[PDB]
Design a protein around this nucleic acid. Structure first.
Lengths: 160, 157
DNA sequence: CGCGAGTCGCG
DNA sequence: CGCGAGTCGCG
């Protein structure tokens, strides 16, 4: 499983769903060649160039962090979503960055026991950290690149 | 993920690179988003949609599974795989070999400008067919997939 | 990872 | 004018 990339004073902590898809089977988050995370954050303006999975630690230099809401074991059901939410919230309470972005609607709905959640900014918070639900970048996410960039861009803008 | 081969097979489905969880359980086409099982059922090679765990059962339908080869590949690697592959097909020499990928066949078999469908090249008596990969990452629509496999199934009568 | 694309750059 | 190119971007 991939290691967290967290610290204090972060502007955003990007939270992935499952601990992997090989976008973790290299030790680097979002390493599967078909994952648009890196491209999206560059284009959304969180970074100045498209980092490479190998350069994941460099995210800190942009005051960005990466984590996942599940940590052990294809499927991925409520069982593990709520449990992960718990460990997750603790981490966010620890480093409490400006915003947490969950890369998945239904995953946030589950992991955080919310329902009928809509894309974007949530009202719920973890201490002062804001909670944002953004569409996952995976190549298996039928979301178009444009909708993706537009969604992340908004978060980036909002944090000014 | 281990081969599922034997003699007298009608078709040996050849995947490309079981990297995207397809072999993440030891089973073939194991990722929940892969349409292999659904496509072969709907194309008529089997009578029900098998589950990855039931892969060995393919033999009961005179079908076999194999592959060409830490997330992507190399030209050397594909030609190399073609070689080991052809040997296997020469061994069990089934009725037809279906390569699940255009560019993969073009490479692994050093062909170029290949079009979908039946190829003229053969391995002994085995026919060679290039069909669109079923992965959930393959932008091919389910219908085009079913129609493509169906043709192979029909042709083998 | 596998797919489409062949219009575009060149002598 | 005809020819060759398929790597490149995308979900």
């Amino acid at each position: 499983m991939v290691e967290d990339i967290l610290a204090p004073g972060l502007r955003v902590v990007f939270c992935g769903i499952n601990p992997g898809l090989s976008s973790a089977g290299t030790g680097f988050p979002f390493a599967h060649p078909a994952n648009r995370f890196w491209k999206v954050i560059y284009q959304a303006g969180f970074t100045d160039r498209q980092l490479k999975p190998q350069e994941a630690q460099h995210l800190l230099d942009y005051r960005c962090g990466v984590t996942k809401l599940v940590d052990r074991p294809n499927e991925v059901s409520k069982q593990e979503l709520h449990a992960g939410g718990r460990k997750l919230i603790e981490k966010i309470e620890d480093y409490q960055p400006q915003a947490l972005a969950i890369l998945g609607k239904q995953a946030y709905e589950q992991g955080f026991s919310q329902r009928g959640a809509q894309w974007g900014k949530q009202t719920l918070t973890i201490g002062s950290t804001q909670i944002w639900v953004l569409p996952n970048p995976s190549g298996l996410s039928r979301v178009s690149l444009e909708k993706l960039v537009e969604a992340y861009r908004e978060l980036d803008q909002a944090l000014v």
